[PDB]
Symmetry: C3
Subunit: 230 residues, 3 copies
């Protein structure tokens, strides 16, 4: 069974052909994240966007493991030239790349992508994105941080989805209503997993309300550390 686990906020982990992939590795500064910077093994890191709660420990993790960081062209240049990360792969929206683990395709999201420096100036890191993985015959749609958009149904029709990770926190993303609508109306995956809630007071939600509002496929409310059952 394909290995795919949730680890708090928008952090997911998966294996394809014995290669380890993490998304949005907010580990050391998320007390609800079950992962440890010291012990996690990865060959690749994929970033949906540059916000602190996704960017997280990418620099320290990339350096320690020698993992390749996949993201926007701006993100790749930033990690490379500002942070000195040796192994980066720049991409953009609609772009697909084949790696030894499987494929990464970046899709559109509605949000922002920046990392705020000490002077208070946000450093722009491209348009925010979602990820479509094809790994061991499974199609995984991580929506990233996003508002509701009708082209979610274009992404899902062109890439029928096994597992969708969808933010339900509200304030900074879709809340319960928009995220359930996204699943019911546009994505219709076999498995839905809600993400990006409870990490901060502002995004505390009852994921049961999400599960009650979803009428299509299976909803799996994964706590940090738990894996998707296929």
């Amino acid at each position: 069974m394909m290995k795919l686990s949730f680890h708090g906020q928008s952090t997911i982990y998966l294996e394809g052909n014995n290669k380890k992939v993490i998304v949005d590795p907010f580990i050391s500064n998320n007390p609800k994240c079950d992962l440890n910077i010291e012990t996690v093994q990865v060959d690749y890191i994929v970033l949906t966007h540059g916000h602190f709660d996704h960017f997280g420990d990418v620099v320290e993790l990339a350096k320690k493991t020698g993992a390749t960081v996949i993201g926007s062209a701006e993100m790749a240049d930033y990690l490379s030239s500002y942070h000195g990360v040796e192994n980066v792969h720049g991409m953009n929206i609609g772009g697909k790349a084949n790696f030894d683990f499987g494929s990464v395709k970046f899709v559109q999201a509605f949000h922002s992508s920046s990392f705020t420096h000490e002077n208070g100036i946000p450093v722009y890191l491209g348009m925010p994105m979602g990820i479509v993985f094809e790994v061991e015959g499974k199609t995984i749609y991580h929506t990233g941080d996003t508002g509701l958009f009708s082209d979610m149904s274009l992404i899902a029709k062109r890439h029928p989805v096994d597992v969708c990770f969808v933010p339900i926190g509200d304030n900074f993303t879709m809340g319960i209503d928009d995220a359930s609508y996204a699943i019911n109306e546009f994505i219709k995956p076999k498995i839905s997993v809600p993400i990006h809630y409870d990490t901060f007071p502002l995004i505390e939600q009852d994921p049961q309300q999400f599960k009650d509002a979803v009428n299509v496929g299976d909803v799996q409310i994964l706590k940090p550390g738990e894996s998707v059952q296929f």
Copy 2:
């Protein structure tokens, strides 16, 4: 009757539960704005995007009044860490937050969002946005600065609109044909108010051309200072 008035370019003012809310306060540097920084009373400032003709007097207005500034996460960081604004609430697209005035939900726009510093370098302030307010049983859709997009119909279906503020200036936003198509095809509000024209030579339009081309609901051509008649 709910208090809702236009003050030139994209500046709207409203009252909910006796709290005063201003959007995109371009006051001191807009000669056609009937408002004055010294006398304007506000509890909340909402910014659709960072451009000078929307950002306007937010810093000086926020310190004089102690008003809370609601905007993108980047806007909140920038205003707080760079300009030292005391009271900010960071949000992002698809996010909804409940205040004592009513609710504010950010939605997508197609435009840009930055404030250009002395040296010609823009500061990135997120993706540009529109606003859905629910205030005193009214749904208000300020589209912000945007081009035409079909998800205007999704925003409107999910949040049936009482008043829509829609830019008609062209060059920088929708002109007459697109704005009127947005109203007739996608949004279909009870009341349409054209905004973002005549302030500069480049965005001079006859709003009567807009009202002529709209076939749905009621078009109220408001001069700065004039309120919406419900």
Copy 3:
């Protein structure tokens, strides 16, 4: 016959009412581009976004020719205030402007828009855009660098397209499958020209796979220097 030519990556050149317009002038540093910055004559330069492979020689080209640079508000601010470019016209998505050559209208794209200064800090230059030209009775849709989006069909239905320039390079934009779907399903132009391939190893594509996959209108595989046959 109206003059319209492809010069590698996303560089196009056209003439209307004896005025010369270039798009994304990446000349000096593209070895597959047949143009020479010393001999290139233009009255107008149009920028879809700020990536180096589009920005290209805009500053040197603009000063030598006195050409007006048309782009995003941010691009206009940046070229003017930072680079001292004399003649700029700021626009934004959905905005249309009439020139002696014909009309330019900016439309949305899904990509990023920056130019990187030292140490991997991007200068933000707005949302990335496509262009709708109306020149000597022809409608040209340059999609810019973009992923697939359904509003390609709104743009094409509101502005029926004679020539579409569409990226097929993949990784950083649509690849073969997405680009051919865009043409077949959404744009349906008289003529399709694939762009943004072969220039770098990462974006190497056989444009015959695109032509075989397109079922609507005529596909013209232009080598750098070749012109559209109407």
